[PDB]
Amino acid sequence: GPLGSDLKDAEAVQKFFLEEIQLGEELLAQGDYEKGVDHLTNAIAVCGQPQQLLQVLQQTLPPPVFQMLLTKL
């Protein structure tokens, strides 16, 4: 059936969110801000209530990189 109707859908999105945050932060740690933010915004995009995540991101990202995140939000 449609996405969300299978118990396995919840497990796949939880894994995806964690993967994207892990990949994003590795990329940012290597200096690839561009690709890092792509993955960070994928993570935010599947998060049902991303208030605290966004707030922590803006506290941990260089302001110019946070502005780029906003363009890809």
Partner: peptide, 13 residues
């Protein structure tokens, strides 16, 4: 480093 991810996970959704 990359375990900064644990802060993002804690914030969660």
């Amino acid at each position: 480093g990359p375990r900064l991810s644990r802060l993002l996970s804690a914030a969660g959704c």
